[PDB]
Enzyme design. Structure first.
Site, PDB file in Angstrom:
ATOM      1  N   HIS A 153       0.830  -1.176   0.000  1.00 37.22           N
ATOM      2  CA  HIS A 153       0.000   0.000   0.000  1.00 37.22           C
ATOM      3  C   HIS A 153       0.881   1.248   0.000  1.00 37.22           C
ATOM      4  CE1 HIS A 153      -3.111   2.656   1.935  1.00 37.22           C
ATOM      5  NE2 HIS A 153      -3.637   2.231   0.824  1.00 37.22           N
ATOM      6  N   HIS A 157       0.737   3.931  -3.578  1.00 33.20           N
ATOM      7  CA  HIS A 157       0.473   5.351  -3.526  1.00 33.20           C
ATOM      8  C   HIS A 157       1.681   6.173  -3.978  1.00 33.20           C
ATOM      9  CE1 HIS A 157      -3.626   5.685  -1.851  1.00 33.20           C
ATOM     10  NE2 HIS A 157      -3.342   4.614  -1.184  1.00 33.20           N
ATOM     11  N   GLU A 289     -10.670  11.002  -4.713  1.00 32.14           N
ATOM     12  CA  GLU A 289      -9.512  10.807  -3.866  1.00 32.14           C
ATOM     13  C   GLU A 289      -9.130  12.004  -2.968  1.00 32.14           C
ATOM     14  OE1 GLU A 289      -5.797   9.767  -5.821  1.00 32.14           O
ATOM     15  OE2 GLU A 289      -4.958   9.144  -3.936  1.00 32.14           O
ATOM     16  N   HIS A 344     -13.223   2.600   3.269  1.00 31.59           N
ATOM     17  CA  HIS A 344     -13.151   2.229   1.860  1.00 31.59           C
ATOM     18  C   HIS A 344     -14.338   1.505   1.263  1.00 31.59           C
ATOM     19  CE1 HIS A 344      -9.485   3.924   0.568  1.00 31.59           C
ATOM     20  NE2 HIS A 344      -9.182   3.846   1.841  1.00 31.59           N
TER      21      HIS A 344
HETATM   22 CU   LIG Z   1      -4.762   3.331  -0.566  1.00 37.83          CU
HETATM   23 CU   LIG Z   2      -7.976   5.315   2.085  1.00 41.89          CU
END
Ligand SMILES: [Cu+2]
Ligand SMILES: [Cu+2]
Ligand SMILES: [Cl-]
Ligand code: NA
Length: 600
Positions: A153, A157, A289, A344
């Site tokens: 993760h 990103h 986002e 999420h």
């Molecule tokens: Cu993420």
């Molecule tokens: Cu998140």
């Protein structure tokens, strides 16, 4: 290049102990020792200023020189973030790996207790990682706290930064908003398969912002300051911060839901931009986002990222207690927290609302004429059964915490894993010619935790991608054989620091991708039944010298368009209007029932 690799490893070594030039003027704001937030606008802004300096460093030697200077005074999380963005994108760093982040900051991946004991005790130290389990969510600790899913993760990103400016870099990240959606949707589908594996209900959305959050204590220290990630007790509600009010987040959500139901978003100049079939999921991922490429940041806001910031600061919303943020502030720790998943699933429901305005696929989009899948078998020790188990591993801490004169301090942890297996797909090619196919493989649970059959439209939220690959099909009968080790979603290899310093870090030099050992869900001691779904599509209609495609499905390809024209998660992204998935199937699709059986 190995000399180049050595000099990069050195920028990342003992980075917690690391701590001016006109170039480095705008940087040095966040204090060393403070936790860097991958989501708060002001930490990301300082992080962008630094990777800009690294990006326009005249040559490799100049990049190393200015970096070495920056790391003496900038915050060390920010530096590792800006430095990994420079190494991933500088042409003159192609072919170099970045060291593993879990070796750079071991104290984000191992409990305070193991770190304290390793700092308590020239021979090798080994610390093996007791107490009542009173939290039922602890059953999924093996998953949420896995070292490799948290490191993935972090890396995803940084391949797909929210501050990416394509005009500055000259380069676009193809379908970055749509891959923001899909990758986080796949983390939700995989987490819910672990929940059902352990007998638990699928997770509920955090869609009401007045509900109390359940608690989570991370037990992670930040050796750089002696500060820790703050625990969150049960029963607190989201509160306004100085930078953002909760009712402003409620506005962002309403305005996004508004545009989904109207079918257009409003750009900054007030023009209407239609959410078409082709670009609508990408447009929506950018404004949700939000990223730099949001069509109207002032109107739709920054909902997902402010969710992380208000949840990470809930114990000290206005800073009066001077407490550090919790694990939701940082992409290398946020999956540890259960609330990651509820947030999420909420964010995934916004995209789900948009996918629901699209018409179900017809037979012409799904069918691949003349190809007929006749059988799929999974080959393992027992055919069509995969076995999972826990296995031990060790992490070298000496590159990130101070080893002194010990040669090695390792911490031992345990992680889920699975026996290798392979697929044999029997395909009849009824044409008089060679066809080229993309084989798409997904896994979906058959029943929920109370034994009810999951209907077709709900397997859209739980189908996890296992593979995507090209094969050629000659007229007549074919058997396509594929091995689990080659999955297009998984990172095949992470060289350690020691590997890269010697030449045993050995093109596929990127660090994004799902961990191999978590390719399939745990299942359970009985054998949990899963639908194995295989579809073949016409590759001449799918197809869009490529580096970093080891994990293409979830990570895309380096400097390259996402190499599959279909919507991410196809055929499962649009409403399916039929109750049982076996009535969805077309001739180029097949389901084999498998079991996954965990060994205690
Ligand atoms: Cu993420
Ligand atoms: Cu998140
Ligand atoms: Cl934060
Ligand atoms: Na792979």
């Amino acid at each position: 290049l190995h000399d180049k690799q050595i000099r990069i490893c050195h920028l990342f070594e003992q980075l917690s102990s690391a701590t001016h030039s006109d170039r480095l003027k705008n940087v040095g704001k966040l204090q060393p020792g403070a936790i860097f937030s991958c989501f708060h606008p002001d930490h990301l802004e300082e992080a962008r200023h630094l990777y800009e300096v690294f990006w326009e460093a005249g040559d490799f030697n100049d990049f190393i020189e200015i970096a070495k200077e920056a790391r003496t005074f900038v915050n060390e999380g920010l530096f590792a973030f800006a430095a990994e963005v420079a190494v991933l994108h500088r042409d003159d760093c192609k072919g170099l790996y970045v060291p593993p982040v879990q070796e750079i900051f071991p104290d984000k991946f191992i409990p305070s207790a193991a770190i304290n004991e390793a700092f308590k005790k020239e021979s090798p130290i080994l610390v093996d990682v007791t107490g009542n389990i009173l939290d039922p969510e602890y059953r999924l600790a093996y998953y949420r706290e896995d070292v490799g899913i948290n490191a993935h993760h972090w890396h995803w990103h940084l391949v797909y930064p929210s501050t990416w400016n394509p005009k500055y870099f000259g380069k676009k990240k193809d379908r970055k908003g749509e891959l923001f959606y899909y990758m986080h949707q796949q983390m939700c589908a995989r987490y819910d398969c672990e929940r059902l594996s352990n007998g638990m209900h699928r997770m509920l959305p955090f869609n009401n912002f007045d509900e109390p959050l359940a608690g989570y204590a991370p037990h992670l220290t930040h050796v750089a300051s002696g500060k820790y990630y703050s625990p969150r007790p049960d029963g607190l509600k989201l509160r306004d911060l100085g930078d953002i009010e909760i009712s402003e987040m409620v506005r962002m959500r309403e305005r996004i839901l508004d545009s989904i139901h109207l079918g257009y978003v409003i750009s900054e100049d007030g023009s209407h931009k239609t959410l078409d079939e082709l670009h609508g999921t990408d447009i929506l991922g950018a404004l949700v986002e939000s990223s730099y490429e949001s069509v109207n940041h002032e109107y739709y806001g920054n909902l997902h990222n402010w969710g992380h910031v208000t949840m990470a600061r809930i114990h000290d919303p206005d800073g009066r207690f001077h407490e550090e943020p919790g694990v939701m502030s940082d992409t290398s720790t946020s999956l540890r927290d259960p609330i990651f998943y509820n947030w999420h699933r909420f964010i995934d429901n916004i995209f789900h609302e948009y996918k629901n305005t699209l018409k179900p696929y017809d037979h012409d989009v799904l069918n691949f004429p003349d190809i007929q899948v006749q059988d799929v078998t999974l080959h393992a020790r027992v055919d069509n059964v995969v076995h999972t188990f826990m296995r031990e591993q060790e992490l070298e801490l000496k590159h990130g915490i101070n080893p002194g004169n010990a040669r090695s301090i390792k911490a031992r942890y345990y992680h889920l894993d699975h026996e290798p297996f392979s697929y044999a797909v029997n395909v009849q090619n009824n044409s008089a010619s060679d066809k080229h196919a993309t084989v798409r493989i997904f896994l979906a649970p058959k029943y929920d935790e109370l034994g009810n059959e999951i209907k077709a439209d709900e397997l859209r939220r739980t189908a996890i991608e296992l593979d995507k690959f090209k094969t050629d099909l000659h007229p007549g009968k074919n058997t396509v054989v594929r091995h689990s080790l080659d999955s297009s979603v998984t990172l095949s290899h992470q060289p350690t620091f020691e590997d890269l310093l010697h030449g045993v870090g050995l093109s596929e030099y990127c660090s994004c991708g799902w961990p191999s050992h978590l390719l399939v869900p745990k299942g359970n001691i009985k054998g949990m039944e899963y639908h194995l779904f295989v579809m073949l599509t016409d590759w001449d209609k799918d197809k869009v010298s490529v580096a970093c495609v080891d994990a293409v499905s979830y990570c895309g390809a380096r400097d390259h368009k996402y190499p599959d024209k279909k919507p991410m998660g196809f055929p499962f992204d649009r409403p399916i209007h039929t109750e049982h998935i076996s009535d969805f199937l077309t001739n180029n699709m097949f389901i084999k029932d498998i079991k996954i059986k965990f060994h205690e």
